[PDB]
mmCIF file of C-alpha atoms in Angstrom:
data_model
loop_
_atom_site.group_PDB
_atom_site.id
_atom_site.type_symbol
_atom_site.label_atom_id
_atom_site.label_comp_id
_atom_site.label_asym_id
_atom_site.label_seq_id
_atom_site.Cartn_x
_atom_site.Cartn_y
_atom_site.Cartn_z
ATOM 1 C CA UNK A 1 0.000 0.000 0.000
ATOM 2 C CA UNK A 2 1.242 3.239 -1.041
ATOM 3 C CA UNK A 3 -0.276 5.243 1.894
ATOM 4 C CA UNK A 4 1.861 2.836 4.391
ATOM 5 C CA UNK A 5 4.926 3.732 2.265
ATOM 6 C CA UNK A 6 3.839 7.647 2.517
ATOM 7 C CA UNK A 7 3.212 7.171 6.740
ATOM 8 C CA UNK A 8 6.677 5.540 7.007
ATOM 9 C CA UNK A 9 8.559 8.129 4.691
ATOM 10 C CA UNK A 10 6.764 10.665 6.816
ATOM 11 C CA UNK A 11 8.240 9.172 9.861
ATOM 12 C CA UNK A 12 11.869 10.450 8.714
ATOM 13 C CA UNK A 13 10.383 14.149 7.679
ATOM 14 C CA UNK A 14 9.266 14.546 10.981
ATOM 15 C CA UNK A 15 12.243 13.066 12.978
ATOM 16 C CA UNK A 16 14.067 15.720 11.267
ATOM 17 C CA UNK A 17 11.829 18.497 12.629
ATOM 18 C CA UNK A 18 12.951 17.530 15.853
ATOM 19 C CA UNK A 19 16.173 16.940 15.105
ATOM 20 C CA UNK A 20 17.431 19.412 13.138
ATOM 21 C CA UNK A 21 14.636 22.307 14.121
ATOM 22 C CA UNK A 22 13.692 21.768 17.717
ATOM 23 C CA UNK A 23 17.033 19.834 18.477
ATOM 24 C CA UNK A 24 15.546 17.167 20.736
ATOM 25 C CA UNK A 25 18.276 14.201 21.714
ATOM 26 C CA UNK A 26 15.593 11.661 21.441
ATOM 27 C CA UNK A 27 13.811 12.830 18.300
ATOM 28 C CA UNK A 28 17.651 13.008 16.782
ATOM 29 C CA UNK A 29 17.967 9.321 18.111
ATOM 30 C CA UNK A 30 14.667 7.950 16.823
ATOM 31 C CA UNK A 31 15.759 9.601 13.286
ATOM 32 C CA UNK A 32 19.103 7.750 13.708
ATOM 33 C CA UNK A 33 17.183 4.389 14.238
ATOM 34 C CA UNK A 34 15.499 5.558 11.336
ATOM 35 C CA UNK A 35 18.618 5.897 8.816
ATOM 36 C CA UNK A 36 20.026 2.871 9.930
ATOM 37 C CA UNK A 37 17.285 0.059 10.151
ATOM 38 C CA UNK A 38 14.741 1.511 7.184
ATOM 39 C CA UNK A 39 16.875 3.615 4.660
ATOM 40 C CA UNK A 40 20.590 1.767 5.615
ATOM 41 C CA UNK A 41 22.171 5.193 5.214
ATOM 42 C CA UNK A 42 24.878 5.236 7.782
ATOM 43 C CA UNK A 43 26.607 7.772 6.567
ATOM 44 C CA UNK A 44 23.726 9.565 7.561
ATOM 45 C CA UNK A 45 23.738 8.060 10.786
ATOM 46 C CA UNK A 46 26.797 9.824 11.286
ATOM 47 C CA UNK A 47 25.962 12.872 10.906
ATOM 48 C CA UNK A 48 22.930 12.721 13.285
ATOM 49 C CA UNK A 49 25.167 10.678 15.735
ATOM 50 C CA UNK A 50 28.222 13.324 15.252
ATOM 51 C CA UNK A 51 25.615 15.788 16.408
ATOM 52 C CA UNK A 52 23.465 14.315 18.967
ATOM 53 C CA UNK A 53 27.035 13.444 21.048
ATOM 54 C CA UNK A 54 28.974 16.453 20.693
ATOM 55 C CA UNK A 55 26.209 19.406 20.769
ATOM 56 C CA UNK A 56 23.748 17.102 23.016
ATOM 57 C CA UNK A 57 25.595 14.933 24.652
ATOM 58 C CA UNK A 58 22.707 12.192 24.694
ATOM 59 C CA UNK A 59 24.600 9.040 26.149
ATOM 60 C CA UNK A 60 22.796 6.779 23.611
ATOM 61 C CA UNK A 61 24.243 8.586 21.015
ATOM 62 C CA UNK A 62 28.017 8.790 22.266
ATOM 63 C CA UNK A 63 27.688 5.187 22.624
ATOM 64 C CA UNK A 64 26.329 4.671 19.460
ATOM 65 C CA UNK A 65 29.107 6.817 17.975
ATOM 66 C CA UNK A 66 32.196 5.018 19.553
ATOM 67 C CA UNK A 67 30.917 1.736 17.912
ATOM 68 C CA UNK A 68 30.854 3.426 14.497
ATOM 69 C CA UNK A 69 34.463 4.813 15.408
ATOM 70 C CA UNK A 70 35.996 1.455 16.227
ATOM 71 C CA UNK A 71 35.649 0.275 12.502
ATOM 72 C CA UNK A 72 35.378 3.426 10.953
ATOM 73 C CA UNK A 73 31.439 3.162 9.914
ATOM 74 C CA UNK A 74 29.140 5.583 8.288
ATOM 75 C CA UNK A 75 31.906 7.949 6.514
ATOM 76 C CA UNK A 76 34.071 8.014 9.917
ATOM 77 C CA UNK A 77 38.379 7.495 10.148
ATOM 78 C CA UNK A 78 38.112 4.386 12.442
ATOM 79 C CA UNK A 79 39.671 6.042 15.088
ATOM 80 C CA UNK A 80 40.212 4.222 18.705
ATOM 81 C CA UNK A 81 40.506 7.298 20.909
ATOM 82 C CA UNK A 82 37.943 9.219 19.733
ATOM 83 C CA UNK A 83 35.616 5.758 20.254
ATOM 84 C CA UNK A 84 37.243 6.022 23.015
ATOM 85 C CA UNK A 85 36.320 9.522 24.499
ATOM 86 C CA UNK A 86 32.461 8.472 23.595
ATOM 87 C CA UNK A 87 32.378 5.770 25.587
ATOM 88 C CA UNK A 88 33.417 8.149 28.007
ATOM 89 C CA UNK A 89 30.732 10.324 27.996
ATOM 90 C CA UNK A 90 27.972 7.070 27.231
ATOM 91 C CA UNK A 91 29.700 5.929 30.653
ATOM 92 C CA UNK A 92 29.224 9.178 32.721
ATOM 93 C CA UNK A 93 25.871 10.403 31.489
ATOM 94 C CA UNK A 94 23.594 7.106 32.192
ATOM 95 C CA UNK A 95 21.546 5.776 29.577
ATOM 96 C CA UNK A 96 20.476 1.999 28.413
ATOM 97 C CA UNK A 97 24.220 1.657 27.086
ATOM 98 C CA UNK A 98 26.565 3.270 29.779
ATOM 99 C CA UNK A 99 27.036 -0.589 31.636
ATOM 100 C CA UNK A 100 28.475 -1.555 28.214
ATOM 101 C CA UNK A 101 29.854 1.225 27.590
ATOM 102 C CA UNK A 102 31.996 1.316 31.049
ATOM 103 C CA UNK A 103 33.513 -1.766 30.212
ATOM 104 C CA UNK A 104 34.647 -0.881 27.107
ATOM 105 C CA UNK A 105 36.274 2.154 28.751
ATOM 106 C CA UNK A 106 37.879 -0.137 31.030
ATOM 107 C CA UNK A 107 39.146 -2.691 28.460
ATOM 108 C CA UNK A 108 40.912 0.565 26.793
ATOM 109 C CA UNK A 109 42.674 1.893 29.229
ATOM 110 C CA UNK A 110 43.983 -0.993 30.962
ATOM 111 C CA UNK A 111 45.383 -2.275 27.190
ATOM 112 C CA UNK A 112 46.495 1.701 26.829
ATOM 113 C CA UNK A 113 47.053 2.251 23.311
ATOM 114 C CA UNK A 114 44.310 4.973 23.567
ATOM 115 C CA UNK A 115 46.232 6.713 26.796
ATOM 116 C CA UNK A 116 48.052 10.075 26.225
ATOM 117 C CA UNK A 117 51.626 8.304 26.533
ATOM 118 C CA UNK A 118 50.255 4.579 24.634
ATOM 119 C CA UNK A 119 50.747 2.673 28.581
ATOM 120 C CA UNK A 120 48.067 0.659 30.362
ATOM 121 C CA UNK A 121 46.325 3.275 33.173
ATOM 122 C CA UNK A 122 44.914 0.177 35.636
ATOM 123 C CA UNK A 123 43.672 3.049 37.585
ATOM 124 C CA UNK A 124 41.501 4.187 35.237
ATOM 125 C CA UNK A 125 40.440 0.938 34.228
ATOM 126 C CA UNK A 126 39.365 0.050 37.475
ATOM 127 C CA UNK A 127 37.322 2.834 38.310
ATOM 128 C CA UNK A 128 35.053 2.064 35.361
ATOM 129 C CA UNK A 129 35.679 -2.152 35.427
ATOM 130 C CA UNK A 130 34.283 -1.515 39.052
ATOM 131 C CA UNK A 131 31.224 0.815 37.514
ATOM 132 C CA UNK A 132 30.438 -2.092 34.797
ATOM 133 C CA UNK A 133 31.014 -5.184 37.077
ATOM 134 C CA UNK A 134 28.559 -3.474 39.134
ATOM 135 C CA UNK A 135 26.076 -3.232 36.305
ATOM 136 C CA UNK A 136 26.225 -7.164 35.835
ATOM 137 C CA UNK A 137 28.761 -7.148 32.708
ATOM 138 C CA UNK A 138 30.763 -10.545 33.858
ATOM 139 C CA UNK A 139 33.743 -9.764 31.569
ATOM 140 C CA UNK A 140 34.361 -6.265 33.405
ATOM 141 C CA UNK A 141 34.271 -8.199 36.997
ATOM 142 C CA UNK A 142 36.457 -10.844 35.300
ATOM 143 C CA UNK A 143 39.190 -7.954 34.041
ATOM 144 C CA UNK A 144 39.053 -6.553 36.767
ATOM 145 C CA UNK A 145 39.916 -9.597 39.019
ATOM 146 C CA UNK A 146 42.813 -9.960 36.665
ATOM 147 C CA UNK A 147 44.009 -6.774 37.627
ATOM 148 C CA UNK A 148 44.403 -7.940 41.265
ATOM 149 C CA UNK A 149 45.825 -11.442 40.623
ATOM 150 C CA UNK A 150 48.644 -9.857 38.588
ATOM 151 C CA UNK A 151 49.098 -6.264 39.288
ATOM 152 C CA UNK A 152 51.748 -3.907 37.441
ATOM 153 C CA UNK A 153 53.750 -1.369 37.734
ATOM 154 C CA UNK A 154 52.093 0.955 39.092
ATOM 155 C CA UNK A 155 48.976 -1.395 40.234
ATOM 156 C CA UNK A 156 50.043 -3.471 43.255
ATOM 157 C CA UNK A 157 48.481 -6.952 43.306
ATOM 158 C CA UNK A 158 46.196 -7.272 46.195
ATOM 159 C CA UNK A 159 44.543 -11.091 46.920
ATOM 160 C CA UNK A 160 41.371 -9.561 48.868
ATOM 161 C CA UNK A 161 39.771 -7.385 45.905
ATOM 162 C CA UNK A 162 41.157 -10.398 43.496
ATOM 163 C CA UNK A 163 38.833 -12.957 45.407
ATOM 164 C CA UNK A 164 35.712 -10.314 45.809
ATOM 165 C CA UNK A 165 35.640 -9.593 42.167
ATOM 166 C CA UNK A 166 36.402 -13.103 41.166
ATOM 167 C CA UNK A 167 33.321 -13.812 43.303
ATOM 168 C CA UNK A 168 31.030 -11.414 41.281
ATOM 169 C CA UNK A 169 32.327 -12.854 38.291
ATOM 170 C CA UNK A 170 31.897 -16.721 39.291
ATOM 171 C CA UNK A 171 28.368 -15.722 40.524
ATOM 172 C CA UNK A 172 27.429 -14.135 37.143
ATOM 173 C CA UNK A 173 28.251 -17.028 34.454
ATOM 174 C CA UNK A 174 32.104 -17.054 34.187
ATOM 175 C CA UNK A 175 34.306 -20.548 34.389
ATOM 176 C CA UNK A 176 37.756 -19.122 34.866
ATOM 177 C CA UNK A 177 36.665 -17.055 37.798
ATOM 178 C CA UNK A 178 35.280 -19.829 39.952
ATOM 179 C CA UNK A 179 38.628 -21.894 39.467
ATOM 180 C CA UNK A 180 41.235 -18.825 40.578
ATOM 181 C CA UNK A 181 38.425 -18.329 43.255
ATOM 182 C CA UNK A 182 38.607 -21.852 44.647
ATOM 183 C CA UNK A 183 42.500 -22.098 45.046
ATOM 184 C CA UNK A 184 41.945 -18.971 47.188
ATOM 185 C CA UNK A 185 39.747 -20.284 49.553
ATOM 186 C CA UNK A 186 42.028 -23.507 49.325
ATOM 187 C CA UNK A 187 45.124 -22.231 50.155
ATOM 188 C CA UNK A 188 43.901 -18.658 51.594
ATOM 189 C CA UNK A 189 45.493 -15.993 49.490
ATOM 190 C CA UNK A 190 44.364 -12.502 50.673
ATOM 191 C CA UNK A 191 41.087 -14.577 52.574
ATOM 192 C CA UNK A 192 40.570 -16.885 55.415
ATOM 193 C CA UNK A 193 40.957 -20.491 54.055
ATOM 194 C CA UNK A 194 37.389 -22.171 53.883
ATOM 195 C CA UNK A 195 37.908 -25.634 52.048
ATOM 196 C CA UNK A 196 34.070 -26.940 52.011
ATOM 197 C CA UNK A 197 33.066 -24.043 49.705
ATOM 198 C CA UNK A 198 36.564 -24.249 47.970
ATOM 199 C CA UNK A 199 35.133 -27.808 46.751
ATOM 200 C CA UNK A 200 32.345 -26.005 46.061
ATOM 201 C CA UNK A 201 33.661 -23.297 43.440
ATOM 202 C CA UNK A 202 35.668 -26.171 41.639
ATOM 203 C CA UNK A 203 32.369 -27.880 41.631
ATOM 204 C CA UNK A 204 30.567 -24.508 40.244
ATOM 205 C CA UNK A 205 33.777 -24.528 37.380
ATOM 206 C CA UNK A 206 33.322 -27.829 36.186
ATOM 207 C CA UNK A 207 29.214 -27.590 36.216
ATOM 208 C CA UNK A 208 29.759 -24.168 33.948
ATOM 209 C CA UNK A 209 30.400 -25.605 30.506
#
């Protein structure tokens, strides 16, 4: 039906009135969903999503944004500090993505290539693992324990965060996490040595998968 066609098409007239008269985040947003899932025009997309991050700073946006900047989508340099820098601000400013996009602001820093001087900042990445972990995102709880088991040069290792966040991790899905976790409680490294629920992680591990 050609009026169906004509109420859809209209849909993207007046997403732009919004956008691009009124300026509302969200009506920019809906037009973005718009480009992308109806007309495919990402390059488009851009364009809204340049806007809507860096005039509006709408979290969904910036979030949106950094994805296209990792691989350089819709027109854009890929470019892995300024994806970066929006998953910064879809971080700070909560929305629906900012869980996801903590962790990938923790997974950047703590690699580093994206810091000022190309090092790992563990400080960094912790304060926005801890954010994400939080959030339920069992990678960024994983990471994080990491962090602790190893430590770095500027990062001291520390046992007692190491089995807390390996906890949060085992709880939420992950395999690896249960199994440092139980040869903590086994031998007691940075906790009190409790060997019935020590079986009981390694029993936990093995279940998983």
């Amino acid at each position: 039906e050609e009026q169906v066609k004509s109420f859809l098409e209209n849909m993207e007239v007046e997403c732009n009135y919004h956008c691009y008269h009124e300026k509302d985040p969200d009506g920019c947003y809906r037009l973005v969903d718009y480009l992308e899932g109806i007309r495919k025009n990402f390059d488009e997309a851009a364009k809204v999503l340049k806007f809507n991050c860096e005039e509006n700073q709408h979290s969904d946006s910036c979030y949106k944004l950094g994805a296209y900047y990792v691989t350089g989508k819709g027109g854009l340099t890929q470019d892995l500090k300024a994806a970066a820098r929006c998953f910064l601000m879809a971080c700070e400013k909560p929305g629906k993505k900012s869980i996801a996009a903590c962790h990938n602001v923790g997974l950047l820093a703590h690699d580093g290539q994206v810091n000022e001087d190309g090092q790992p900042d563990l400080g960094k990445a912790r304060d926005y693992y801890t954010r994400a972990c939080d959030g339920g995102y069992t990678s960024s709880c994983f990471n994080l324990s990491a962090m602790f088991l190893q430590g770095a040069p500027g990062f001291p290792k520390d046992m007692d965060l190491a089995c807390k966040y390996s906890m949060k991790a085992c709880d939420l899905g992950h395999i690896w996490a249960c199994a440092n976790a139980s040869r903590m409680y086994k031998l007691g490294d940075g906790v009190d040595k409790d060997e019935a629920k020590a079986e009981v992680l390694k029993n936990r591990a093995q279940q998983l998968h």
